[PDB]
Ligand binder design. Sequence first.
Ligand code: CLA
Ligand code: CLA
Ligand code: CLA
Ligand code: CLA
Ligand SMILES: CC(/C=C/C=C(C)/C=C/[C@@]12O[C@]1(C)C[C@@H](O)CC2(C)C)=C\C=C\C=C(C)\C=C\C=C(C)\C=C\[C@@]12O[C@]1(C)C[C@@H](O)CC2(C)C
Ligand SMILES: CC1=C[C@H](O)CC(C)(C)[C@H]1/C=C/C(C)=C/C=C/C(C)=C\C=C\C=C(C)\C=C\C=C(C)\C=C\C1=C(C)C[C@H](O)CC1(C)C
Ligand code: SF4
Ligand code: SF4
Lengths: 64, 80, 162, 197, 101, 211, 41
Amino acid sequence: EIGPKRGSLVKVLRPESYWYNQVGKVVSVDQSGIRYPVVVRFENQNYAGVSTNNYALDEIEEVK
Amino acid sequence: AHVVKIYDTCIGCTQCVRACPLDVLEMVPWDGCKAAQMASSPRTEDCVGCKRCETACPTDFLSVRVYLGNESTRSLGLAY
Amino acid sequence: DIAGLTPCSESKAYNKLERKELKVLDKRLKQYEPGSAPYLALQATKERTENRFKTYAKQGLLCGNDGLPHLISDPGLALRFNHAGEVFITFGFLYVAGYIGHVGRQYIILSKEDAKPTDKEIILDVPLALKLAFQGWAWPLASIQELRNGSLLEKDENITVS
Amino acid sequence: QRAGNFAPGSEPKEYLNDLPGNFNFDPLELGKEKGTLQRYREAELIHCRWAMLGAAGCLAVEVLGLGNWYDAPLWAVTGDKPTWFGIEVPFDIATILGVEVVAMAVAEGLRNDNQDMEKRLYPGGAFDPLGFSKDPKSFEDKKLKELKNGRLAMVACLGFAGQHAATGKPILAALGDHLSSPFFNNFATNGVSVPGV
Amino acid sequence: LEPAVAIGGSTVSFLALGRFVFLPYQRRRTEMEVGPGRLGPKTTGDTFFDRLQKPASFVETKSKDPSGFGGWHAALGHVFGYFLLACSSLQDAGQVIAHWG
Amino acid sequence: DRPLWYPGATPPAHLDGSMLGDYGFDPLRLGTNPDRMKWFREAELTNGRWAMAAVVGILFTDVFTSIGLVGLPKWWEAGAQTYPIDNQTLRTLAIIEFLLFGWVETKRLYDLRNPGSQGDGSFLGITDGLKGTENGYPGGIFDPLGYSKTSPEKLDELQNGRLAMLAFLGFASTAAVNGQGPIESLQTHLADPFHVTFATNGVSIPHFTEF
Amino acid sequence: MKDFTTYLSTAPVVGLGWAIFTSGLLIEINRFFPDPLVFSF
Ligand code: CLA
Ligand code: CLA
Ligand code: CLA
Ligand code: CLA
Ligand SMILES: CC(/C=C/C=C(C)/C=C/[C@@]12O[C@]1(C)C[C@@H](O)CC2(C)C)=C\C=C\C=C(C)\C=C\C=C(C)\C=C\[C@@]12O[C@]1(C)C[C@@H](O)CC2(C)C
Ligand SMILES: CC1=C[C@H](O)CC(C)(C)[C@H]1/C=C/C(C)=C/C=C/C(C)=C\C=C\C=C(C)\C=C\C=C(C)\C=C\C1=C(C)C[C@H](O)CC1(C)C
Ligand code: SF4
Ligand code: SF4
């Protein structure tokens, strides 16, 4: 309810993440008041091998 | 010895405590993630620096960091 | 007769070298029968050497102090004299290189507009590659028309750490 | 207040709106900032005034028949007596160089300390003894006339330099040549103005 | 040519120039520049006897902004700008510096 | 709009829209962009319009030259015979041509970017008559035969222009492999149709079969 | 048949089609037309 719509593509704004200025699909948004509830999923894997990460509400921007 | 740090971007998957081969990290309860647990490192003097915890960390960027520093007999891995 | 060089048509070193090669090739003619396969092969090599020296010369190509042909590369200096052909025709490479680049860029953009564009890279879409290869003959026109529309670049969507 | 379009159906620049001698010419968008546009304005006016005086003297010596303008400063190198309208002034080259340095130094030093945005382009008072600045309308079209004549004089000075750079004939002679054979003698026949002609 | 009239007529011209027409421009132009202090630190209590600007009154003695050391500073124009003209001995030594062409 | 260049299986994308001489021929899909299509049609119109005057200036004079009415040279050496005459200027024709041609070319250029952008304060008194109807189709230039109601005359114009462009390319290529004129190469083709052919007369394709 | 023609689109289409075509083209050009050091202008 507080995060973006589930299933909507967003843009990451974390300046130290491997998916900076990229576009990722939001899989779920937690509603427990945690620090980083918006969980996103990206098509391309990172250097470690994972493809999903959870960001906060302020570091999530709509695509273009 | 080396200085290990755990940032707040932790998700509590308990993988670094499973990857540590010297029993340095532990899992303490927390109230900031879905798993309600955050890693900690009480036995920092036993850190050897193999950086297996950083490879076991799944979040981007890593929630645990191993900053190498001074070396002792335990941190140098000497058996003699 | 520029940059202190001289035309290959009036150089003694050029003729000296020509006679040297024609002699070292002719020395191997005595070791074979006048009508066999090694004789025919040596005769073909001799004809190719004479033709190459004649072709290399009388075509404005000039050599310097050693009989070896030198090449003028400055435009203007190669255009004021009949030396444009030696290296100023860089447009042939620029045309083939731009052809390769345009075909690859057209295949990357078109394949990315499909679900999972990865397996399309290890397993090429041959009917799409052959169609895109014969459609890029007028590549500079497509490049200038794709630049004015702004469809050639990106504004700020790059993985940077700056 | 656009005094004419430099190009019919051009792009109207919203920076050169209320300016004298405006034609919306500038395509490189130089002087787009409102601060540097004033410096460019005063630089244009000063250059126009200097080029008008230069082209006037350059054509006056040749129409009066006193020698080439390029050959006028050759007296110091050759070593003879220089003159102005046949007076034979006895000044040496070091003396005229010194008086020119000091006089232009005090004149330019006094000009640079104006601190008036209007008086730096168009002053008045002492610099306008005839006082034809009372009529604001006459002042307006006289300012436009000044800019239109100054730009033509700048192009004329660059023309004198190019004409003497290609050939060695004097200014009026350069016109006579073009009047002796227009289709056979022009800049495209010098062999140097066009690399290939 | 004469050294007495070329470096003497030089000094006074450079001095009168700097005192009558280039003085307010120099004073107005030196206002944006700051002194030696590293953005004004403590000096007297830290023993910085060399960075502190020399005193010796440094006040108005003439009119319309005077110059104590400027009269000796700007005066170097006498030898910087005209000892070259004063030493123009190549005009009679055969070494032509006219640069023909 | 008009009959397709092929009888079938060749459906274009941006050629469905109406246009002068629309035959649906675009295999490289060059005119996909609308602005680039709008610019390319003007380029085709100008190229065809000048190629028509060039091909008539060559062919019409060659007819009288081959018959025997005039003693004018051919097109490949008309330049080499104009300047050796006593009353002929030096190579200043290129410069005066560039200046006087660029003057009207820039008017036609600014008219394409902004159609009908000929304000009253530009020319002397014909500042209003230069308002063209469409891009590449003006009105005050031509005086007769243009106030009809049906436009397919432009189809004849475009077809004649395309045929003229192909003809000039043939002029430059035929005179490059044989060294003769167009009607000089045409008249010999009527005599021996199987001997003087591009496949065997000129050195066009390397045919070396002399058994 | 579909599996064979899709197998032929991985590594042969890029390492034996283009390589053989380009190599054969350059070799036949240098065979019929002997050694080219200028544009023959
Ligand atoms: C419609 C234009 C046209 C016409 C009528 C001709 C006619 C002729 N050409 Mg030419 N040619 C043309 C265009 C044309 N050409 C173009 C565009 C080129 C550049 C590729 C050439 C290059 C060329 C060469 C190098 C030679 C000829 C030669 C000849 C003559 C012998 C025929 C031949 O060898 O094959 C013709 C060769 C061609 C390439 C033309 C075939 C393809 C054209 C472009 C198709 C157009 C035909 C059109 C659709 C139908 C005819 C229209 C007509 C009834 C008005 C002949 C009179 C030969 C010659 O002079 O004999 C000594 C010769 O050596 N042509
Ligand atoms: C057709 C694809 C393609 C295109 C359009 C480009 C374009 C470019 N590359 Mg590049 N590159 C490519 C493939 C491509 N590359 C591949 C496959 C590699 C790995 C070997 C590289 C490695 C590479 C490096 C290391 C660098 C570039 C650089 C550059 C830029 C400078 C120009 C240049 O020619 O550099 C040189 C390009 C090469 C040396 C690669 C040549 C290898 C061939 C041409 C690639 C094969 C493509 C394939 C046939 C396409 C498939 C066709 C399709 C129908 C199936 C330019 C925008 C430079 C740069 O950083 O930008 C300024 C640079 O340093 N590239
Ligand atoms: C000292 C020269 C000089 C200066 C400072 C100016 C300054 C100005 N002009 Mg002017 N102009 C000049 C010369 C100059 N002009 C000449 C000689 C002509 C006749 C061709 C004109 C014709 C002209 C017109 C028609 C108009 C202006 C206008 C303007 C004003 C706005 C344009 C602008 O912002 O650009 C700023 C100027 C500069 C930044 C000067 C920079 C010069 C650069 C370095 C280019 C010089 C290189 C050049 C190509 C050399 C040619 C030599 C050749 C052999 C290569 C501006 C205040 C417009 C106006 O509103 O009037 C008030 C206007 O409509 N000018
Ligand atoms: C005899 C056994 C053999 C050999 C020698 C090879 C060799 C190779 N394979 Mg292959 N492979 C094999 C068996 C074999 N494979 C089998 C049984 C399968 C299962 C069907 C595969 C499936 C397979 C896949 C899916 C791929 C390869 C690829 C490659 C190439 C490595 C990538 C590279 O060069 O960098 C990359 C080069 C660039 C980025 C620059 C592009 C320009 C290149 C150099 C032009 C291509 C020419 C070619 C590589 C050289 C000739 C090939 C040679 C076989 C004749 C390499 C030449 C990769 C490939 O296709 O190469 C791209 C790849 O994607 N192989
Ligand atoms: C100062 C000057 C002339 C002064 C002449 C003098 C003092 C002559 C004096 C003497 O001759 C006498 C009397 C007698 C001689 O014996 C001795 C000398 C001493 C020689 C001319 C300037 C002349 C200055 C010129 C020619 C300026 C050129 C400007 C151009 C080309 C315009 C460019 C732009 O258009 C672009 C390209 C892009 C646009 O965006 C912006 C703009 C900047 C507007
Ligand atoms: C300030 C004031 C104020 C007060 O109150 C009053 C008073 C009024 C008095 C005043 C003043 C004024 C003045 C000074 C004015 C001036 C002007 C000048 C000087 C000049 C012109 C000047 C000049 C000018 C323009 C000029 C121009 C020129 C030209 C184009 C030239 C041309 C030519 C050439 C190229 C070459 C050839 O071979 C020749 C010819 C063809 C011929
Ligand atoms: S670096 Fe090795 S020893 Fe140290 S905490 Fe990580 S896994 Fe344990
Ligand atoms: S591996 Fe990383 S995310 Fe998982 S518990 Fe350890 S520090 Fe936290």
